[PDB]
């Protein structure tokens, strides 16, 4: 199939992708009893530096499902076009939300096989102690590794194409084309995560990463 090319992206989209996958918002054991505009949950002064945190969902159902629960958050956070709730600075993310109580004693380890130009490289590892984990969290963790080691979001690196595939034990698999950004700004890039897609962490067989140089 045809994957998207890094060369299609503007310098901004690229810096934005770098920024998103390197600086996620991570926080455990917080709660919101406030809904904004049907879809969003508001956690006042819970964001970075005491900012207000707005968690956006695809539907009312999702927002309602997590209203008044002890949740854990792991998501790509952004600032531009993040609608304010108070006078305080507002910080946004889509999805990234699981129940705080659903935990494992030790971290589950998930292997990520890597190939570059069809040549097998070192297997990478990602970890989670959540029984149920967002696809977003695992995707950020993979992309952080690929950013660090292969410089996927640096303009002048030799990586031009890449595909991350989640080989599931269940029948539906998942994948991400790392250069198929939905727009150039954060609020567009991160919107792919608004469904709050969540997996049983033991349902993943492994992750396959294929990167390609041009050339």
């Amino acid at each position: 199939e045809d994957l998207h090319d890094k060369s299609e992206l503007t310098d901004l989209a690229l810096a934005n992708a770098y920024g998103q996958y390197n600086h996620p918002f991570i926080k455990e054991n917080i709660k919101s009893d406030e809904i904004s505009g049907e879809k969003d949950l508001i956690f006042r002064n819970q964001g970075d530096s005491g900012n207000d945190l707005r968690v956006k969902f695809a539907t009312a159902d999702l927002a309602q499902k997590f209203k008044n629960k002890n949740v854990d958050i792991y998501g790509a956070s952004f600032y531009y076009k993040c609608e304010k709730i108070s006078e305080n600075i507002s910080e946004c993310l889509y999805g990234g939300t699981t129940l705080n109580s659903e935990k494992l004693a030790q971290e589950r380890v998930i292997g990520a096989n890597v190939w570059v130009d069809g040549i097998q490289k070192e297997t990478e590892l990602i970890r989670t102690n959540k029984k149920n984990v967002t696809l977003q969290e695992l995707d950020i963790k993979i992309r952080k590794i690929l950013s660090d080691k292969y410089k996927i979001y640096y303009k002048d690196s030799e990586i031009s194409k890449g595909l991350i595939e989640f080989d599931m034990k269940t029948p539906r698999d998942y994948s991400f084309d790392i250069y198929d950004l939905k727009g150039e700004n954060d609020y567009e890039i991160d919107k792919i995560y608004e469904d709050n897609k969540t997996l049983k962490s033991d349902d993943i067989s492994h992750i396959d990463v294929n990167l390609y140089t041009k050339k």
Epitope: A15, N16, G19, H23, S77, F78, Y80, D186
Partner: T-cell receptor
């Protein structure tokens, strides 16, 4: 926790005599940098090193040389070939290349004919 | 690759507010501000890493532009101890930082 240092504070040399400036860092940083600062031009990058045993030329590398045997240090040698060696010399390190830099206290070098 | 700072020189009275500005035509994944005293090492004040980020450290407020092309530093209630060279620096493309020429601030008691 740790830091980055330079020595000595002041250096005086006769024109034509090579000197080497020391910069040492226990911050566990991979990347190290040498700058000079002249009143008209602010900070200008002389040489830098993204990782142990790898270095490359800055914008004003002529007359200077470096080496990077060790992670923790990055010595700058000023050679006779430099021409305007008199300057304030600043070394810096970062976790990885292009990240936020932490600077040493600097060294004044004056050279006269 | 270029980073422009304005104003180049600023003298102001204790108690006033001021804004210094750093801009480029280039995009940056991060931007740093430093404060340097003459004959000393620049001191890191902040790093901003997300377009539209605002960070507040006491009297100093830093902002990263929405398009990642600029930043500003805003000082409120200026104090004589704020006097110094304020340098902005951006993540460069070749494992380096790109430095502005600075705003030289003098705050009069």
């Amino acid at each position: 926790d740790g830091g980055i240092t330079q020595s000595p504070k002041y250096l005086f040399r006769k024109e034509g005599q090579n000197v080497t400036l020391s910069c040492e860092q226990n911050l566990n940083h991979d990347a190290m940098y040498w700058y000079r600062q002249d009143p008209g031009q602010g900070l200008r990058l002389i040489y830098y090193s993204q990782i142990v045993n790898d270095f490359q030329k800055g914008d004003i590398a002529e007359g200077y040389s470096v080496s990077r045997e060790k992670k923790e240090s990055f010595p700058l040698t000023v050679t006779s070939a430099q021409k305007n060696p008199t300057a304030f010399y600043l070394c810096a390190s970062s976790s990885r290349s292009s990240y936020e830099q932490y600077f040493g206290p600097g060294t004044r070098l004056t050279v006269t004919e | 690759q270029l980073l422009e700072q304005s104003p180049q020189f600023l003298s102001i009275q204790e108690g006033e507010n001021l804004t210094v500005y750093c801009n480029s035509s280039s995009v940056f994944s991060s931007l740093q501000w430093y404060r340097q005293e003459p004959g000393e090492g620049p001191v890191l004040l902040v790093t901003v890493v997300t377009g539209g980020e605002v960070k507040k450290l006491k009297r100093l407020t830093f902002q990263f532009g929405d398009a990642r092309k600029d930043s500003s530093l805003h000082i409120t209630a200026a104090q004589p101890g704020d006097t110094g060279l304020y340098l902005c620096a951006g993540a460069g493309s070749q494992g380096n930082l790109i430095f502005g020429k600075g705003t030289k601030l003098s705050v009069k008691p």
